[PDB]
Design a binder for this molecule. Structure first.
Ligand SMILES: O=c1ccn([C@@H]2O[C@H](COP(=O)(O)OP(=O)(O)O[C@H]3O[C@H](CO)[C@@H](O)[C@H](O)[C@H]3O)[C@@H](O)[C@H]2O)c(=O)[nH]1
Ligand SMILES: O=c1ccn([C@@H]2O[C@H](COP(=O)(O)OP(=O)(O)O[C@H]3O[C@H](CO)[C@@H](O)[C@H](O)[C@H]3O)[C@@H](O)[C@H]2O)c(=O)[nH]1
Lengths: 431, 431
């Protein structure tokens, strides 16, 4: 409608930040001003795409670091973890308020894992939107992203996981948040009843093919489509990668990507050896994007054969159309990239919403959820994913449906259509 | 001579071990009352133990958790109100019993919630007893927060801290009202309760649940408390003929029974079991308890090699079969391990996931992730023919048979009694 200053706020990893870059670029092209508010590590990434950056604390790697490496006695580790956690929350609260209160955004869009947005927008009296890539609103259709059961349960169970999560999350931070609300933001104390979080317009930046809206979604909870960044333009592929791909094809071998993102594992070399053995057993060429290790870190430890190339990060929109299947961790964005390219997809989930997407790929018939990762289960899965016609057709159909979605345009329309509602929701919390 | 109150809520598996312990205490010259739901009166009294009724039967809550598609804001209000009424009835009935009976010592399953408060009001020694991981430790995750696959010790420890906080804060409003209005105490919180001080009896074998070096000296893994009903059981003719037929035909004989569960499609599950049993070419004693709603199909159709029987005492039946497939309930797992059976576990809820992993880890059985005709057929083949697994099951039988859980628990009670008194008094208001 007219030129607004957006603040787009998120914490987490690349997959929390990249969709906001895509949305930010789209908003800039609609005439608006955009600041992405996230961790220092992502400044160059954000600025390389023409978006303004502001730093906040709240980097979850800091918390993961204490769960892996702290090896003091039990109660000491717990005290040290609680204190680090409390200090990390405090820094997130204080840095996010300092940015927002200085910049005077017209509109704030936030991932709700960042916690601060509903309070900050109340203090500044501005429209507020949530956006996220995993189930996070009350519904019977899907369990909460962090409480996915081993196998599907009924709708009341799913609904109750959301109620439990919202209560655990709030009550875990409510002491610190209410102190900050009172001492710093100038507000009164709040609780779940006053926050009415389920009133806030919510943008699920995922395809409705994988995450269809549920019969019980509110009107302002919208599944927009993935917010794809499109980095194939400007990517200059290194020679080794081009030669490897051409060699696979010249030799008539199937070509697979394997990559589990960043993870910490018990035995790095054993995992690598099981992947190598699996790739040898299934007669395949493998583009490997290793990010596992015993400590946070330093990639390839053992002698890899001719049919395996350890490459860094390569933009998936360039690579995925050229391979026959992909094996990955089921991260929301990575799943979007494999589905967008019509790849049969093997997922080995490790944490959180990866379990959600692993089940969804199996349910939609486009891939296989690995329970156990070893040389045999992966070799079987690689055989099915590179030869099963039904699965390839289902992956093709999903590719077709995703190509007709335009998640960014849908999300921007949703913002314009919901702006006045979003303002009204904020103002209802003002006393 | 002491007057023991043994207090528990839940199902038969929560009550049966206390019967066994109660009989042992009576033979040591003590008095025993078991305090649980009306449904178990006949069971308790048939074994010569005194019974007192309390409310708090989790079946009442299961209704709302396990219905399909009712959940929404209004249903959640009705569910909260029902939950609050259920808690209140448990609180009031348990206080009425304990305050009238004046036990010298209370031993409680901590899922019952009330014991730590009641013993503080009456100033008596308090013990906990339970059959799944419930004390802070790095060695095991909390029973209700078992990860998909093993994580590190810091992760395990933190699941216990999270669980303790969630459980307490879920009930603390109502418990504190009752503490003040009814018990005559002040309000409390997790910090004041110091729950990890309380002497704790894990009534499970240390072969399946070995103590960790980080277990406090008052946390004891005693061995299972077995009831032993084989000598009174008169097998019906159909069962005898079936057992004799399996053996005369040289077929392996398996028990399959998942207890009481609510599933999405009852007939499909039954058909997958039938197909699996045919493929493995075994004879199956089936104890069906699954249905689409809590209303009763122990009935089902079945071929000659499958016999639907009711409940049969497992200490009679498990010695007569070659393997067992079950849900991994703590008591049922103890019965299959005690009998030296290779054990297939398909977990559904809670601590079943803990025991499923433990049987796989000690090499006596297989954990099913997915239950279908193929996974079960493969598992039934391994469980009835793998020599290594049968040997390992025999060795575990030997280790269990050398434990005397009852005698160990009674000694632990006498050895920790003064400490148990002291822990209660530290919570008590100094006059
Ligand atoms: O070599 C690479 C690696 C990644 N990507 C892209 O980068 C994004 C990664 O997204 P995602 O898989 O969502 O991010 P991760 O940071 O890898 O995953 C974490 O963050 C996600 C969003 O919070 C969660 O879904 C995951 O469970 C969590 O592990 C996607 O667009 C990928 O296609 C590439 O183009 N090339
Ligand atoms: O036909 C039968 C059925 C049961 N039993 C015995 O009854 C007890 C049942 O114990 P358990 O499996 O502990 O009880 P359930 O009530 O089936 O299981 C619930 O309660 C347990 C203890 O709280 C939890 O470990 C389980 O996860 C939960 O499902 C065991 O000793 C069995 O051997 C028999 O002898 N014959």
């Amino acid at each position: 409608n007219k030129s607004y200053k957006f603040g787009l706020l998120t914490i987490g990893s690349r997959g929390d930040v990249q969709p906001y870059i895509a949305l930010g670029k789209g908003l800039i092209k609609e005439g608006h001003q955009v600041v992405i508010i996230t961790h220092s590590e992502f400044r160059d990434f954000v600025e390389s795409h023409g978006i303004q950056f502001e730093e906040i604390a709240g980097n979850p790697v800091e918390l993961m670091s204490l769960m892996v490496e702290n090896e003091s006695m039990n109660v000491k580790m717990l005290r040290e973890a609680s204190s680090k956690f409390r200090g990390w929350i405090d820094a997130l609260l204080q840095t996010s308020w300092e940015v927002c209160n200085r910049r005077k955004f017209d509109i704030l869009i936030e991932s709700p894992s960042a916690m601060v947005g509903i309070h900050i927008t109340e203090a500044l009296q501005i429209p507020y939107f949530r956006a996220f890539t995993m189930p996070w609103t009350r519904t019977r259709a899907y369990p909460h992203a962090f409480i996915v059961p081993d196998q599907k349960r009924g709708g009341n169970y799913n609904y109750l996981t959301h109620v439990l999560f919202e209560n655990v999350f709030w009550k875990g931070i409510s002491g610190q948040v209410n102190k900050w609300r009172v001492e710093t933001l100038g507000l009164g104390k709040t609780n779940l009843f006053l926050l009415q979080q389920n009133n806030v317009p919510f943008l699920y930046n995922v395809s409705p093919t994988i995450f269809p809206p549920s019969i019980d979604f509110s009107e302002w909870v919208r599944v927009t489509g993935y917010w794809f960044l499109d980095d194939k333009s400007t990517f200059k592929p290194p020679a080794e990668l081009q030669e490897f791909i051409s060699e696979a094809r010249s030799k008539g071998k199937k070509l697979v990507y394997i990559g589990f993102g960043s993870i910490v594992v018990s035995n790095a070399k054993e995992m690598t050896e099981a992947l190598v053995e699996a790739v040898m057993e299934a007669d395949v060429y493998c583009i490997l994007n290793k990010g596992w290790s015993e400590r946070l870190g330093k990639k390839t430890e053992v002698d890899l054969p001719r049919n395996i190339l350890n490459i860094g990060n390569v933009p998936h929109d360039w690579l995925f159309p050229q391979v026959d299947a992909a094996v990955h961790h089921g991260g929301s964005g990575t799943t979007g990239a494999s589905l967008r390219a019509g790849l049969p997809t093997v997922i080995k989930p490790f944490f959180g919403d990866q379990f959600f997407y692993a089940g969804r790929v199996e349910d939609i018939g486009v891939g296989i959820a690995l329970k156990k990762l070893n040389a045999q289960t992966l070799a079987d899965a690689l055989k099915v994913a590179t030869t099963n016609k039904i699965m390839k057709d289902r992956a093709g159909l999903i590719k077709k449906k995703i190509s007709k979605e335009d998640g960014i345009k849908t999300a921007i329309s949703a913002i314009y259509n919901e702006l006045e509602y979003a303002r009204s929701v904020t103002l209802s919390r003002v006393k």
